[PDB]
Coordinates of C-alpha atoms and ligand atoms in Angstrom, one line a residue:
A1 CA 0.2 -0.2 0.1
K2 CA 3.4 2.4 0.0
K3 CA 3.9 4.6 -2.0
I4 CA 7.9 5.1 -2.6
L5 CA 10.4 6.7 -4.5
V6 CA 14.3 5.4 -4.5
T7 CA 17.1 6.5 -6.4
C8 CA 20.7 5.4 -7.1
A9 CA 23.5 8.3 -7.5
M10 CA 23.9 9.5 -10.6
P11 CA 26.6 8.4 -12.9
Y12 CA 28.9 10.9 -14.1
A13 CA 28.9 11.7 -17.5
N14 CA 32.2 11.3 -18.9
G15 CA 33.0 7.7 -17.3
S16 CA 31.6 5.0 -18.3
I17 CA 30.2 2.1 -15.9
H18 CA 32.1 -0.1 -14.2
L19 CA 31.2 -2.8 -11.5
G20 CA 31.5 0.2 -8.9
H21 CA 28.6 1.5 -10.1
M22 CA 27.1 -1.8 -10.8
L23 CA 27.2 -2.5 -7.1
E24 CA 24.8 0.2 -6.6
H25 CA 22.3 0.0 -9.0
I26 CA 21.9 -4.4 -8.7
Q27 CA 21.1 -2.9 -4.3
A28 CA 19.0 -1.1 -5.5
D29 CA 17.3 -2.8 -7.5
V30 CA 16.9 -6.1 -5.9
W31 CA 15.4 -4.0 -3.3
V32 CA 13.0 -2.6 -5.2
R33 CA 12.0 -5.2 -6.9
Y34 CA 10.8 -7.3 -4.0
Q35 CA 9.3 -4.0 -3.2
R36 CA 7.1 -4.4 -6.3
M37 CA 6.2 -8.3 -5.3
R38 CA 5.3 -7.1 -2.4
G39 CA 3.1 -4.7 -3.9
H40 CA 3.8 -1.8 -3.3
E41 CA 3.4 1.3 -5.8
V42 CA 7.7 2.1 -6.2
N43 CA 9.1 4.5 -8.5
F44 CA 12.9 3.8 -9.6
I45 CA 14.8 7.2 -10.3
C46 CA 18.2 7.5 -11.7
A47 CA 20.0 9.5 -14.4
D48 CA 22.6 11.2 -15.6
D49 CA 25.4 14.0 -14.0
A50 CA 26.1 15.9 -16.9
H51 CA 27.1 19.6 -15.9
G52 CA 30.0 21.4 -15.0
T53 CA 34.0 22.2 -16.3
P54 CA 34.9 19.2 -17.2
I55 CA 33.1 18.2 -19.1
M56 CA 32.9 21.0 -21.0
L57 CA 36.2 21.1 -21.5
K58 CA 36.0 17.4 -22.6
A59 CA 32.6 18.8 -25.4
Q60 CA 35.2 21.1 -26.7
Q61 CA 38.9 18.4 -26.8
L62 CA 36.0 16.2 -29.4
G63 CA 34.9 19.1 -30.9
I64 CA 31.0 18.8 -30.5
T65 CA 28.7 20.2 -28.3
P66 CA 28.7 19.0 -24.3
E67 CA 24.6 18.2 -25.6
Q68 CA 25.8 16.0 -28.3
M69 CA 28.2 13.8 -25.5
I70 CA 26.2 13.2 -23.8
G71 CA 24.2 12.3 -25.0
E72 CA 25.9 10.0 -26.5
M73 CA 27.6 8.8 -22.6
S74 CA 23.7 8.7 -21.9
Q75 CA 22.7 6.2 -24.4
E76 CA 25.8 4.3 -23.3
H77 CA 24.9 4.5 -19.9
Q78 CA 21.3 3.2 -20.1
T79 CA 22.8 0.3 -22.4
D80 CA 24.5 -1.4 -19.9
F81 CA 22.3 -0.6 -17.2
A82 CA 19.6 -2.4 -19.3
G83 CA 22.0 -5.3 -19.7
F84 CA 21.9 -6.5 -16.3
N85 CA 18.4 -6.0 -15.9
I86 CA 18.3 -2.5 -13.7
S87 CA 14.5 -1.6 -13.9
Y88 CA 14.0 2.1 -13.6
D89 CA 11.0 3.9 -14.1
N90 CA 12.7 6.5 -15.4
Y91 CA 16.5 7.3 -16.2
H92 CA 16.4 11.0 -17.4
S93 CA 19.3 13.8 -16.9
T94 CA 20.3 16.6 -14.3
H95 CA 20.6 18.6 -18.3
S96 CA 16.4 18.7 -18.4
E97 CA 14.7 21.4 -18.2
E98 CA 12.8 20.5 -15.4
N99 CA 15.4 20.6 -13.6
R100 CA 16.9 23.6 -14.7
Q101 CA 12.6 25.4 -13.7
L102 CA 13.8 23.2 -9.9
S103 CA 16.7 24.3 -9.8
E104 CA 16.2 28.3 -10.4
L105 CA 12.7 27.4 -8.0
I106 CA 14.8 25.9 -5.5
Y107 CA 17.0 28.7 -5.6
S108 CA 15.2 32.1 -5.4
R109 CA 14.1 30.2 -2.7
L110 CA 16.3 29.9 -0.7
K111 CA 17.9 33.1 -1.4
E112 CA 14.2 34.2 0.1
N113 CA 15.3 32.9 2.7
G114 CA 17.6 34.7 3.6
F115 CA 19.8 31.4 3.0
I116 CA 22.4 32.9 0.0
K117 CA 25.4 34.5 1.2
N118 CA 27.7 36.8 -1.2
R119 CA 31.7 36.7 -0.8
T120 CA 34.4 37.3 -2.8
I121 CA 36.8 34.8 -3.4
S122 CA 40.2 34.7 -5.3
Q123 CA 41.7 31.4 -7.7
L124 CA 44.0 30.7 -10.0
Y125 CA 42.8 32.1 -13.3
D126 CA 43.9 30.8 -17.1
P127 CA 44.0 34.4 -18.2
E128 CA 44.6 33.1 -22.6
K129 CA 41.9 30.8 -21.6
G130 CA 40.3 32.9 -20.3
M131 CA 39.0 31.0 -17.5
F132 CA 39.1 29.8 -13.9
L133 CA 40.6 26.8 -13.5
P134 CA 40.0 23.8 -10.8
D135 CA 42.9 22.5 -8.4
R136 CA 43.4 19.4 -11.3
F137 CA 44.0 21.9 -14.3
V138 CA 46.5 23.5 -13.3
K139 CA 49.9 21.9 -12.6
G140 CA 53.9 22.1 -12.0
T141 CA 56.2 21.7 -9.9
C142 CA 56.5 21.1 -6.7
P143 CA 57.3 22.5 -3.8
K144 CA 58.6 21.0 -1.7
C145 CA 61.0 18.1 -3.6
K146 CA 61.2 19.8 -6.7
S147 CA 59.2 16.9 -9.0
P148 CA 57.6 18.0 -11.9
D149 CA 54.7 18.0 -13.9
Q150 CA 52.6 16.9 -11.4
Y151 CA 48.8 18.3 -10.5
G152 CA 46.8 19.8 -8.4
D153 CA 46.9 19.9 -4.6
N154 CA 49.5 17.5 -3.9
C155 CA 52.7 15.9 -5.5
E156 CA 53.1 12.2 -6.6
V157 CA 56.6 11.6 -5.5
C158 CA 56.9 12.7 -1.9
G159 CA 53.6 13.0 -1.2
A160 CA 53.2 16.0 -0.2
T161 CA 49.6 18.6 -0.2
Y162 CA 49.6 21.8 -0.4
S163 CA 47.8 24.4 -2.3
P164 CA 47.7 24.5 -7.0
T165 CA 48.9 28.2 -5.1
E166 CA 52.8 26.9 -3.8
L167 CA 53.6 25.0 -7.1
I168 CA 56.4 26.4 -8.6
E169 CA 56.5 27.8 -12.7
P170 CA 52.3 26.1 -12.6
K171 CA 50.8 26.2 -15.6
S172 CA 47.2 25.8 -17.1
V173 CA 46.2 21.9 -18.2
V174 CA 44.3 23.7 -20.5
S175 CA 46.7 26.1 -22.4
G176 CA 49.2 26.0 -20.7
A177 CA 49.5 29.7 -19.7
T178 CA 50.5 30.7 -16.5
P179 CA 47.4 30.9 -13.9
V180 CA 47.1 34.2 -12.1
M181 CA 44.9 34.7 -9.6
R182 CA 41.8 36.3 -10.4
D183 CA 38.9 37.8 -7.4
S184 CA 35.3 36.8 -8.0
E185 CA 31.1 37.2 -6.5
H186 CA 30.9 33.9 -5.3
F187 CA 27.4 33.0 -3.9
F188 CA 27.5 29.9 -0.9
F189 CA 24.8 28.3 0.3
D190 CA 24.7 28.6 4.6
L191 CA 24.7 25.3 5.8
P192 CA 25.6 26.1 9.1
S193 CA 22.3 27.4 9.3
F194 CA 20.8 24.4 9.4
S195 CA 22.7 22.7 12.0
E196 CA 20.5 21.7 14.4
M197 CA 17.6 20.7 12.4
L198 CA 20.8 18.0 10.9
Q199 CA 21.5 16.5 14.3
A200 CA 18.7 15.9 15.5
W201 CA 17.8 13.8 11.6
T202 CA 21.0 12.1 13.1
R203 CA 20.3 11.2 17.2
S204 CA 17.1 9.6 15.3
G205 CA 18.0 6.3 14.7
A206 CA 16.5 6.3 11.2
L207 CA 20.5 6.0 9.6
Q208 CA 23.1 3.2 9.4
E209 CA 25.1 3.5 12.9
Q210 CA 28.1 4.1 10.6
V211 CA 26.9 6.8 9.1
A212 CA 25.1 8.5 12.0
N213 CA 29.0 7.9 13.6
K214 CA 31.0 9.5 11.5
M215 CA 28.5 12.4 10.5
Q216 CA 28.9 13.5 14.0
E217 CA 32.8 13.9 13.3
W218 CA 31.3 16.4 10.8
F219 CA 29.4 18.2 13.5
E220 CA 32.3 18.4 15.5
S221 CA 34.9 20.1 12.6
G222 CA 32.1 22.4 12.4
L223 CA 29.8 22.7 9.3
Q224 CA 30.4 25.5 6.5
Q225 CA 29.2 27.7 4.6
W226 CA 28.5 25.9 1.1
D227 CA 30.2 28.0 -2.5
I228 CA 27.3 26.7 -5.3
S229 CA 28.1 28.9 -8.0
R230 CA 31.0 29.3 -10.8
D231 CA 31.6 31.5 -13.3
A232 CA 31.3 31.1 -17.4
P233 CA 32.3 29.6 -19.3
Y234 CA 30.9 27.0 -17.7
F235 CA 28.1 24.0 -19.0
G236 CA 25.3 23.8 -17.2
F237 CA 22.5 26.5 -15.4
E238 CA 23.0 30.3 -15.7
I239 CA 22.2 32.2 -12.4
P240 CA 19.0 34.5 -12.4
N241 CA 19.9 37.8 -11.7
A242 CA 23.2 37.4 -11.7
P243 CA 25.0 37.5 -15.7
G244 CA 27.8 35.5 -15.8
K245 CA 27.0 33.0 -12.8
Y246 CA 25.8 29.5 -12.9
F247 CA 24.7 27.1 -10.8
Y248 CA 27.8 24.7 -9.5
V249 CA 26.6 20.6 -10.2
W250 CA 26.3 19.5 -6.9
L251 CA 23.1 22.5 -6.5
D252 CA 21.4 20.7 -9.7
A253 CA 22.5 17.1 -9.4
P254 CA 20.2 15.8 -6.1
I255 CA 17.5 18.2 -7.7
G256 CA 17.9 16.2 -11.2
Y257 CA 16.6 13.8 -8.7
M258 CA 13.1 16.1 -8.6
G259 CA 13.8 16.6 -11.6
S260 CA 14.2 12.8 -13.1
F261 CA 10.8 12.5 -11.1
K262 CA 8.7 15.2 -12.3
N263 CA 9.4 14.3 -16.1
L264 CA 8.1 10.3 -15.2
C265 CA 5.6 12.3 -13.9
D266 CA 4.7 14.4 -16.9
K267 CA 4.5 11.6 -19.3
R268 CA 3.1 9.7 -18.1
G269 CA 0.4 12.7 -17.9
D270 CA -0.2 12.7 -14.2
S271 CA -1.2 15.7 -12.4
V272 CA -1.0 14.9 -8.5
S273 CA 1.7 12.9 -7.7
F274 CA 4.8 15.4 -8.2
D275 CA 3.9 17.0 -5.5
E276 CA 2.3 13.9 -3.4
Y277 CA 5.5 13.2 -3.1
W278 CA 7.7 15.9 -2.8
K279 CA 5.3 18.4 -1.0
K280 CA 6.0 18.7 3.0
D281 CA 2.6 17.0 4.0
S282 CA 3.4 13.7 1.7
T283 CA 3.2 10.7 3.4
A284 CA 5.2 8.3 0.7
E285 CA 8.2 7.3 1.0
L286 CA 12.1 9.0 -0.6
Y287 CA 15.1 6.3 0.1
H288 CA 18.9 7.3 -1.4
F289 CA 20.6 4.7 -2.0
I290 CA 24.0 5.8 -2.4
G291 CA 28.3 5.4 -1.3
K292 CA 30.4 6.5 1.0
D293 CA 31.8 9.5 -1.0
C294 CA 28.1 10.4 -1.5
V295 CA 26.9 11.4 1.9
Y296 CA 28.2 14.2 3.0
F297 CA 26.3 15.1 0.2
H298 CA 23.5 13.7 0.3
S299 CA 23.1 13.6 4.5
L300 CA 23.8 17.9 5.1
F301 CA 23.8 19.4 2.3
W302 CA 20.6 17.9 0.3
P303 CA 18.5 17.7 3.4
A304 CA 19.1 21.2 4.4
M305 CA 18.6 22.6 0.9
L306 CA 15.1 20.5 0.9
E307 CA 14.5 22.1 4.3
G308 CA 15.6 25.2 3.1
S309 CA 13.0 25.7 -0.4
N310 CA 9.9 23.9 2.0
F311 CA 10.0 20.5 0.5
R312 CA 10.2 17.3 2.0
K313 CA 13.7 15.1 3.4
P314 CA 14.8 12.1 2.6
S315 CA 13.6 9.6 4.9
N316 CA 16.5 7.3 5.0
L317 CA 19.6 7.1 3.3
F318 CA 20.9 3.7 2.3
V319 CA 24.7 3.5 2.5
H320 CA 27.2 1.0 1.0
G321 CA 30.6 0.0 0.6
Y322 CA 33.1 0.2 -2.3
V323 CA 34.1 -2.5 -4.5
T324 CA 37.5 -4.2 -4.7
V325 CA 38.2 -7.2 -7.0
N326 CA 40.6 -9.2 -5.6
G327 CA 40.4 -8.2 -1.9
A328 CA 42.2 -4.8 -3.8
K329 CA 40.6 -1.5 -5.4
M330 CA 40.0 -2.4 -8.9
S331 CA 43.4 -2.5 -10.5
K332 CA 43.3 -1.0 -14.4
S333 CA 47.2 -3.1 -14.7
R334 CA 46.2 -5.8 -13.5
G335 CA 42.9 -6.2 -15.1
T336 CA 40.3 -6.0 -12.4
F337 CA 39.4 -2.4 -13.4
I338 CA 36.3 -4.1 -15.1
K339 CA 33.8 -2.1 -17.2
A340 CA 29.7 -3.0 -17.2
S341 CA 29.6 -3.4 -20.7
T342 CA 32.4 -5.4 -20.7
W343 CA 31.4 -8.4 -18.2
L344 CA 28.9 -8.9 -20.7
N345 CA 30.4 -10.3 -22.7
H346 CA 32.0 -13.1 -20.6
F347 CA 28.8 -13.9 -17.8
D348 CA 25.5 -13.1 -18.4
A349 CA 24.3 -10.0 -15.7
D350 CA 22.0 -12.5 -12.9
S351 CA 25.3 -14.2 -11.7
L352 CA 27.0 -10.7 -10.9
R353 CA 23.5 -9.4 -9.5
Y354 CA 23.5 -13.0 -6.9
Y355 CA 27.2 -12.6 -6.3
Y356 CA 26.7 -9.2 -4.8
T357 CA 23.5 -10.1 -3.6
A358 CA 24.9 -13.2 -1.2
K359 CA 28.0 -10.2 0.2
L360 CA 26.4 -7.2 1.0
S361 CA 23.8 -6.3 4.4
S362 CA 22.9 -3.5 5.9
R363 CA 26.2 -2.7 6.9
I364 CA 29.3 0.4 4.7
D365 CA 31.7 -2.9 3.9
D366 CA 33.2 -2.9 1.5
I367 CA 32.6 -6.4 -0.8
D368 CA 35.0 -7.3 -2.6
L369 CA 35.0 -9.3 -5.8
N370 CA 37.2 -12.7 -5.2
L371 CA 37.0 -14.0 -9.2
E372 CA 37.6 -17.8 -8.2
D373 CA 35.3 -17.3 -5.6
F374 CA 32.8 -16.0 -7.6
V375 CA 33.0 -19.4 -10.0
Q376 CA 32.6 -21.3 -7.1
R377 CA 29.8 -19.8 -5.5
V378 CA 27.4 -19.5 -8.2
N379 CA 28.0 -22.9 -9.7
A380 CA 27.6 -24.6 -6.0
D381 CA 24.3 -23.1 -5.3
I382 CA 23.2 -21.8 -8.7
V383 CA 24.0 -24.8 -11.0
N384 CA 24.0 -27.5 -7.6
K385 CA 21.3 -26.6 -5.6
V386 CA 18.6 -24.9 -6.8
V387 CA 18.5 -25.1 -10.5
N388 CA 19.9 -28.0 -9.6
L389 CA 16.1 -28.8 -8.0
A390 CA 15.0 -28.6 -11.9
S391 CA 16.7 -30.2 -13.7
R392 CA 17.7 -33.0 -12.0
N393 CA 13.3 -34.2 -12.1
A394 CA 11.8 -32.5 -15.0
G395 CA 13.1 -35.3 -17.1
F396 CA 11.6 -37.7 -15.4
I397 CA 7.5 -35.4 -15.9
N398 CA 8.5 -34.4 -19.1
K399 CA 8.9 -38.1 -20.8
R400 CA 7.0 -40.5 -18.3
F401 CA 4.1 -38.9 -17.5
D402 CA 3.4 -36.3 -20.1
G403 CA 4.8 -33.3 -18.2
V404 CA 1.5 -33.4 -15.3
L405 CA 3.7 -32.9 -11.8
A406 CA 1.2 -35.5 -8.8
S407 CA -2.6 -34.5 -7.8
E408 CA -0.7 -34.0 -3.8
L409 CA 2.4 -33.1 -1.9
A410 CA 4.8 -35.7 -0.4
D411 CA 6.3 -33.9 2.2
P412 CA 3.2 -31.4 3.0
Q413 CA 5.4 -31.3 5.5
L414 CA 8.3 -29.8 4.6
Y415 CA 6.6 -27.9 1.7
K416 CA 5.4 -25.6 5.3
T417 CA 8.5 -25.4 6.1
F418 CA 10.0 -24.0 2.6
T419 CA 6.5 -21.5 3.0
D420 CA 7.1 -20.6 6.9
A421 CA 10.5 -19.1 6.6
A422 CA 8.9 -16.7 3.7
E423 CA 8.3 -14.2 6.8
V424 CA 12.4 -14.2 7.6
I425 CA 12.9 -13.8 4.1
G426 CA 10.7 -11.4 2.9
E427 CA 12.4 -9.1 6.4
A428 CA 15.7 -9.7 5.3
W429 CA 15.1 -8.4 2.2
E430 CA 12.9 -5.4 3.4
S431 CA 15.9 -4.7 5.6
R432 CA 18.8 -4.8 3.0
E433 CA 20.2 -7.6 5.1
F434 CA 20.4 -9.3 1.3
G435 CA 23.6 -11.9 2.8
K436 CA 21.8 -13.6 4.8
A437 CA 18.3 -13.6 2.8
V438 CA 20.5 -15.8 1.2
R439 CA 21.4 -17.9 3.1
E440 CA 18.8 -19.2 4.6
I441 CA 17.2 -19.3 0.5
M442 CA 20.4 -21.5 0.2
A443 CA 20.0 -23.7 3.4
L444 CA 16.5 -24.7 2.2
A445 CA 17.9 -24.9 -1.3
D446 CA 20.6 -28.0 0.4
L447 CA 17.6 -29.2 2.6
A448 CA 15.2 -29.5 -1.1
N449 CA 18.6 -31.3 -2.7
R450 CA 18.9 -34.0 0.9
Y451 CA 15.1 -34.8 -0.4
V452 CA 15.6 -35.7 -3.6
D453 CA 19.2 -37.7 -2.6
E454 CA 16.5 -39.3 0.6
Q455 CA 14.3 -40.4 -2.5
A456 CA 16.7 -42.3 -4.7
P457 CA 14.8 -41.3 -7.7
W458 CA 17.7 -42.6 -10.6
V459 CA 17.0 -45.3 -8.2
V460 CA 12.8 -45.8 -8.4
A461 CA 13.0 -44.9 -12.0
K462 CA 14.8 -48.4 -13.4
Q463 CA 12.6 -49.8 -10.9
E464 CA 9.0 -51.9 -11.8
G465 CA 6.3 -50.5 -10.7
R466 CA 7.0 -47.0 -9.5
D467 CA 5.7 -44.9 -11.8
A468 CA 3.4 -42.7 -9.4
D469 CA 6.6 -42.9 -6.4
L470 CA 8.7 -41.5 -9.4
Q471 CA 6.1 -39.0 -10.4
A472 CA 6.1 -38.0 -6.6
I473 CA 9.3 -37.2 -5.7
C474 CA 10.0 -35.6 -9.0
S475 CA 7.2 -33.4 -8.5
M476 CA 7.7 -32.4 -5.1
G477 CA 10.9 -31.1 -6.3
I478 CA 9.8 -29.0 -8.7
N479 CA 7.6 -27.3 -6.5
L480 CA 10.3 -27.3 -3.5
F481 CA 12.1 -25.3 -7.2
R482 CA 9.3 -22.8 -8.0
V483 CA 9.4 -21.8 -3.6
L484 CA 12.8 -20.2 -4.0
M485 CA 12.7 -19.4 -7.2
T486 CA 10.2 -17.2 -6.2
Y487 CA 12.1 -16.4 -2.6
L488 CA 15.3 -15.4 -5.8
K489 CA 13.4 -14.1 -7.7
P490 CA 14.0 -10.5 -7.3
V491 CA 17.8 -10.9 -7.4
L492 CA 17.8 -13.0 -10.9
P493 CA 15.2 -11.7 -13.3
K494 CA 15.8 -13.7 -16.6
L495 CA 16.2 -16.9 -14.8
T496 CA 13.9 -16.8 -13.1
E497 CA 11.4 -15.8 -16.5
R498 CA 12.8 -19.4 -17.8
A499 CA 11.8 -20.5 -14.3
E500 CA 8.1 -19.1 -15.2
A501 CA 8.3 -20.4 -18.3
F502 CA 9.3 -24.1 -17.7
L503 CA 6.5 -23.9 -14.7
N504 CA 4.2 -22.6 -16.3
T505 CA 3.3 -19.7 -14.4
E506 CA 4.2 -15.8 -12.9
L507 CA 6.2 -16.3 -9.4
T508 CA 3.6 -14.1 -7.0
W509 CA 5.1 -13.9 -3.1
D510 CA 1.8 -14.9 -1.9
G511 CA 1.8 -17.5 -5.0
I512 CA 3.4 -20.3 -3.0
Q513 CA 0.5 -21.2 0.0
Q514 CA -0.9 -23.0 -2.8
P515 CA 1.6 -25.8 -5.0
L516 CA 1.7 -26.6 -8.1
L517 CA -0.1 -30.0 -8.1
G518 CA -2.1 -31.8 -10.9
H519 CA -0.1 -29.2 -13.2
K520 CA 1.5 -29.1 -17.0
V521 CA 4.7 -27.8 -17.3
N522 CA 7.3 -27.4 -20.6
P523 CA 10.4 -28.8 -21.1
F524 CA 13.7 -26.7 -21.3
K525 CA 17.4 -27.2 -22.2
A526 CA 19.5 -26.0 -20.0
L527 CA 18.1 -23.4 -17.0
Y528 CA 22.0 -22.0 -16.3
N529 CA 24.6 -23.7 -17.3
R530 CA 28.2 -24.0 -15.9
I531 CA 31.2 -21.6 -15.6
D532 CA 34.9 -22.2 -14.9
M533 CA 38.6 -20.1 -14.3
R534 CA 39.6 -19.2 -18.0
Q535 CA 36.6 -17.8 -18.3
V536 CA 37.3 -15.5 -15.8
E537 CA 41.2 -15.0 -17.3
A538 CA 39.2 -13.6 -20.4
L539 CA 37.9 -11.3 -18.5
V540 CA 40.8 -9.3 -17.0
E541 CA 43.1 -10.0 -20.4
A542 CA 40.2 -8.2 -22.0
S543 CA 39.9 -5.7 -19.1
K544 CA 43.8 -4.5 -19.3
Ligands
B3M601 C1 23.2 13.7 -7.4 S1 24.2 11.6 -7.1 C2 25.8 12.2 -8.2 C3 26.8 11.9 -7.6 C4 27.6 12.2 -8.9 N1 27.7 12.3 -9.9 C5 29.2 10.9 -8.5 C6 30.5 11.3 -8.8 O1 30.4 12.3 -9.9 O2 31.3 11.0 -8.5
ZN602 ZN1 56.6 16.8 -3.9

């Protein structure tokens, strides 16, 4: 009965989707698919984060408009996410008319309410190109060790950190000109004005314990005002009444969550739902799935902006850790920096969805893709536990019983054990204790294969007059498979489609209470094949 708006963090428009993005979007998608299975109204929303100086400069280097460039990357991203069956209700852009109007509205409300401050700052400026330089577009000689060709605020030889104004003989990365210090008036959002509100939210108990603990560090350091403006030239939204000024991307980017939802409503011809979800009196739930590096922005700056502009705030933040491969940060030289597009040339989407789901929890711990373990676990759990219940039993049913399952359950007590687990498994999906859910499902799968082993259908099948026993055993196994595939339906969308085709039925959460009796199933060829380390080695080689 709930109305839920769920988001993922927005991929940056100038980089391909990699396995780190996929952890976040798979985690959210599993949760979203479970919520849909329980009958709720869910809106799963994302977008490309498409503004800013790096995007402007990259387009210039490519010789195309930024609009053309971001359109091409948005299509690439959406192709990759479609390949992993991420079931968005809408995927939009921060570069949209909906986000322009909402960004202008929110800024005007913040300004009218006293939360925008004007301050003159000094920043390095490229006088040949004619633009202010972000830190990483300044290079020069390290003031400490004198190593040349160092970028931004740190030296990769001696490890020193410093202001780029301390670089010796600085050069613009854009033009090679010597940058100079130049003043500019900037507009600042007065985040400190919201400190008491944000502190109350932190101790409310909604957020993850590890997130709340980190927020206390940030309050202890002290909240600062945040610069929300940038000078022309820029790729973004111009600030009303401030010629030559633009909104900085991190003002307009989360407003893109709202813009993407407004776009969805407008395309549907739905004139009520936007206010029902975003007005202060909303009874709908709003959840953001994010990574560790987005927490400050989503837990402090974003709720403050919404409060200051008379909109509702997030119901919760769901934070995950970073992805590692073979225990370490992804490494280009080792071939463990793996693109989502590359993954799908070697493996299916379900394999990675399963593996991530089996490792995920409600905490913010990093998630390790160990590639040797990936092969072992997919084969052990998917092929040999779950799919085995269908593959070892379906042939007898199709060949000796015309595809018809028995008229009664052979072991009603065992079946009840399986359906009784629905409450704990569903609660584990609901609470994002994904590893717990998978452990419970696989424990059931072990019981199911123990039942079939005990009944020994490969023996019964050869013994005169035991046709009825064989049909009973094999039908029981298939009904246990039906239940397990229901519990795994949020996890494995394509395997589930193949299972529903075999079973001649849609899998619903409540449907497990009625087993398939006197029921025709269809033949299938391999529901799920084994993988091997040769394929892993090819993936790694292709990623170098
Ligand atoms: C509103 S969520 C925005 C997330 C950023 N695009 C993450 C990044 O670019 O590193
Ligand atoms: Zn140095």
